[PDB]
Design a protein around this nucleic acid. Structure first.
Length: 902
DNA sequence: CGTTGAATGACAGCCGCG
DNA sequence: GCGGCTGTCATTCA
């Protein structure tokens, strides 16, 4: 096995790295790394190094890393560019590992932990740790063991031990139902005093120091707390042992509302799962508690329990510890799904960066590019600060609010990355500017062709067409690698079919699973001997067939992740290759594109229908366009279709056969018009929607920009068994919308699209009749609870106090007396409910923690003094109205038509 | 925290009005 | 009271 790195850090004049060596042994070494940078020199000084612009550069080998930056700042003082990799860790890595890293996740120690802390006087502050740490569950991927630490005596109680026999038992028997999978992997350890404990823990830590440190919210609590507790009880020098280099930094993160701090453990990679999840889950959630996120993906959350956590240790210390074990285990199961940890490992190494830098697009690319340009003896531009200037972005069409019966949408492929390639945009391929006519002039093709020599963007930029720029080259490489890997994947899929049938009726022989390369299919070299193989060979082989199957997935996805982040980085000032003009070129170019094709798609449906400038493209947002199909369905006659699937295939046919080509023809003219280095604008039919043939349903409708709904039957070719609702923007997607409502509205919409007004009306009349019977939380609202401070003058409403916050403060006004109440921290979400004026809370609204019941204390007061009328009205009716007006329908019989004017 | 630019829509507060 | 703006606070397409 080729050796790889685990972690790396720079402390003073040296590099501290942890890594696996040629023999799977984790070592750690200090290195007096001598960096190198560069400055522009005289061409007559024949060198082998050149910046991306072409100018010759001379290497500056430094004595140590201080001189490096001491020079970098000294160069900044003289006014001359200092080129090269300043993040010496990055360089160090490229240098120390110059080849493709192949790692063995099995040698990388990945710890996952959680701690419990009994506190009567409110939520325990991590930067204070005023209370004792009374439990710790710390799982380790190496040993595949859960190491538990139970405190038996604290100012808050003295308890028996935790019984694993009981923990295994069933709920109805008195157990905690800790899962059989982990029951043999637990390792209990009780202690007499906190000190006895922490000290053992701190000690167990060194015995098995983590490389990748994860767990839920462990970076803003578990770690900060444990660090500070130990510090307070033993002092900073004891706490710092928490770092394998005994170096820690109290990095202060001044949020956009207030502040809180996190501890930096040099020599460790903190990948807090909540954040890992938040970036790669791709889906907003009304709550990010491990509880909500666990039910959401495995059908079960954390252990349930009677009474408040505040007293769970005393009253039932048994559950309390099982609970702490189950929590560390939910995360482990979620990851068993998402693979986010693995993804990270993969990603980070492909780019040769500190694993946790994965959370950063700017840093991953900077790295990827650097290693590339390095391989070919080129030096990277020096980064430079630039005023943060806002530039234009995507083009969103103002949709005419209406219902649209048949819609067909096509989407441009990787628009932004693609544009960079076709126009060849890069800091060093800028050939120059050109007089610029209005954007519409270039959309109707009535504008003087920009340049007859260079590649062009509608914002006045011109790029060379001979040279292939650094940026586009790099995307194209990624773009290829992906198709490449997703090529080794589509392969294992065929061998998972050839081997699947080899188990329908296996033979009997003393054979071993043949050695092939599932990345590349079978021919005769091994496709032949697929019958004499025993029944034992056939099954162990298919275990080694799909093991790779996923291998591709991981790469193709990390590749897709990069493809998609690139623009963002390019648009970010802290980026090395950032450029305002290039940013605007990209953006402005797609503006032209999307609307140019709009013109083309509009002129082609007008011919094939002999119509008078009918506006076929009803809406388009960024890289896609929705087409009204009505006029097409009528050329054939809506009554000449055997059923639904009939007219769909019709459209699908028309799409591919006639339209796609009309488009490629178009985009090709445009590529010529701008004189780009390469035609890469490719659109694909995406969705096909309309109501169920024969029904009174309307099929779809638009409220306005970013707000519409469709009854789709076929997405990119995959036909559905039952129509599927694609709802965007509407409150049914609004995480802050009640649930009894995020439901109805949804039904309402569906009844609207496949049934029709008659339906909608009946439902509504019901959901309005039986409204007074819903579970308070079901009909409650949501939102982020920020700046709670800025508006609570004496605990009362001040100036411009939002509806949710001024509700939170009617809440404080209710829980001021019982500290066993759950005060709401700033940053998190909070449910809300109106109040039938003339009540206790002497106000308007009362809020509280999202995903949490409302305290018994004040729970049964609300549940009698809450306004339905005003609640129904504002969270269901108000928005429905907005819905049905656009679709031009009525949620309730006998209306006055005139009501739609002015 | 981490990586853009367009766009809704729930509310709080003035302003202009015999 | 009530319709426009302008302006925070929240969320979300692509």
């Amino acid at each position: 096995m080729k050796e790889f790195y685990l972690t790396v850090e720079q402390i003073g004049d040296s590099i501290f790295e942890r890594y696996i060596d040629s023999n799977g042994r984790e070592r750690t070494r200090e290195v007096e790394y001598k960096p190198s940078l560069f400055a522009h020199c005289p061409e007559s000084q024949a060198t082998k190094y050149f910046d991306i612009y072409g100018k010759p550069c001379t290497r500056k080998l430094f004595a140590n890393m201080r001189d490096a930056s001491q020079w970098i700042k000294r160069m900044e003082d003289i006014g001359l560019e200092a080129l090269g990799m300043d993040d010496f860790k990055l360089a160090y890595l490229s240098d120390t590992y110059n080849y493709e890293i192949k790692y063995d996740h099995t040698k990388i120690r990945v710890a996952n932990f959680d701690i419990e802390v009994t506190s009567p006087d409110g939520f325990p502050e991590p930067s204070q740790a005023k209370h004792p740490i009374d439990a710790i569950t710390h799982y380790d991927s190496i040993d595949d063991r859960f190491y538990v630490f139970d405190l038996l005596n604290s100012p808050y109680g003295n308890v028996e031990e935790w019984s694993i026999e009981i923990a295994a038992k069933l709920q109805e028997q008195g157990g905690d139902e800790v899962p059989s999978e982990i029951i043999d992997k637990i390792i209990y350890m009780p202690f007499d005093n906190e000190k006895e404990l922490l000290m053992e823990y701190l000690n167990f830590w060194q015995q098995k120091t983590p490389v990748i440190l994860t767990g839920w919210n462990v970076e803003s609590f578990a770690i900060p707390y444990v660090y500070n507790r130990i510090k307070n009880i033993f002092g900073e020098s004891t706490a710092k042992r928490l770092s394998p280099h005994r170096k820690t930094r109290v990095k202060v993160i001044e949020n956009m509302y207030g502040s809180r701090e996190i501890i930096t453990l040099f020599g460790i990679s903190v990948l807090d799962y909540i954040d890992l999840y938040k970036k790669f889950s791709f889906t907003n959630q009304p709550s990010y508690s491990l509880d909500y996120i666990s039910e959401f993906e495995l059908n079960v959350g954390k252990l349930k329990y009677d009474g408040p956590i505040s007293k769970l240790r005393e009253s039932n210390h048994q559950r309390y510890i099982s609970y702490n074990i189950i929590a560390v285990y939910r995360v482990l199961q979620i990851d068993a799904k998402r693979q986010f940890i693995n993804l990270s490992l993969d990603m980070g190494y492909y780019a040769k960066i500190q694993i946790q830098s994965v959370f950063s697009p700017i840093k991953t690319w900077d790295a990827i590019i650097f290693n590339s340009l390095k391989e070919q003896n080129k030096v990277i531009p020096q980064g430079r600060s630039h005023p943060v200037q806002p530039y234009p972005g995507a083009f969103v069409k103002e949709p005419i609010p209406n219902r649209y019966k048949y819609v067909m949408s096509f989407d441009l492929t990787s628009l932004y990355p693609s544009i960079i390639r076709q126009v060849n945009i890069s800091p060093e391929t800028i050939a120059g500017t050109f007089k610029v006519a209005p954007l519409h002039d270039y959309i109707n093709a009535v504008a003087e062709r920009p340049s007859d020599v260079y590649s062009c963007s509608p914002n006045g930029m011109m790029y060379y067409k001979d040279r292939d720029g650094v940026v586009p080259t790099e995307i194209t490489k990624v773009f290829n690698q992906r198709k490449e890997h997703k090529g080794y994947m589509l392969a294992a899929q065929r061998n998972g079919e050839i081997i699947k049938e080899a188990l329908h009726n296996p033979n009997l022989s003393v054979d071993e699973p043949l050695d092939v390369d599932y990345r590349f299919d079978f021919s005769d070299e091994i496709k032949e001997k697929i019958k004499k193989l025993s029944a034992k060979s056939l099954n162990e082989m298919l275990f080694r067939a799909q093991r790779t199957e996923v291998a591709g997935m991981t790469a193709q996805i990390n590749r897709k992740l990069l493809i998609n982040s690139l623009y963002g980085a390019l648009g970010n000032v802290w980026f090395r290759y950032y450029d305002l003009r290039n940013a605007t070129a990209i953006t402005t170019f797609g503006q032209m594109a999307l609307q140019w094709i709009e013109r083309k798609v509009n002129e082609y449906l007008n011919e094939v229908c002999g119509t008078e400038g009918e506006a076929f493209v009803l809406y388009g947002d960024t890289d896609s366009i929705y087409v009204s199909a009505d006029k097409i369905i009528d050329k054939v006659g809506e009554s000449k279709f055997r059923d639904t699937n009939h007219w769909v295939d019709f459209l699908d046919k028309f799409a591919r056969e006639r339209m796609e080509p009309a488009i490629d023809r178009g985009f090709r003219e445009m590529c010529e018009y701008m004189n780009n280095k390469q035609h890469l604008m490719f659109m694909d039919r995406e969705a096909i929607a309309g109501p169920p043939l024969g029904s009174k349903g309307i099929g779809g409708f638009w409220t306005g920009k970013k707000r519409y709904a469709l009854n789709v039957w076929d997405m990119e070719g995959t036909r559905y068994a039952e129509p599927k609702l694609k709802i965007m923007g509407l409150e049914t997607q609004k995480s802050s919308t009640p649930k009894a409502v995020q439901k109805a509205l949804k039904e309402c919409i569906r009844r609207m699209l496949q049934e029709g007004e008659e339906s909608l009306q009946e439902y509504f009349k019901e959901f309005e009749k039986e409204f007074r019977q819903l579970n308070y939380i079901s009909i409650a609202s949501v939102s982020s609870a920020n700046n709670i401070a800025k508006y609570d003058v004496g605990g009362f409403p001040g100036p411009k106090c939002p509806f949710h916050i001024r509700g939170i403060l009617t809440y404080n006004r209710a829980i001021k007396g019982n500290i066993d109440a759950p005060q709401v921290v700033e940053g998190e979400k909070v449910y809300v409910l109106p109040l039938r004026e003339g009540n206790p809370f002497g106000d308007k609204c009362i809020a509280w923690p999202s995903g949490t019941e409302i305290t018994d204390l004040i729970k049964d007061d609300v549940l009698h003094w809450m306004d339905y009328t005003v609640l129904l009205e504002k969270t269901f009716i108000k928005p429905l109205e907005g819905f049905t007006s656009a679709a031009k329908l009525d949620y309730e019989k006998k209306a006055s038509l005139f009501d739609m004017f002015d």
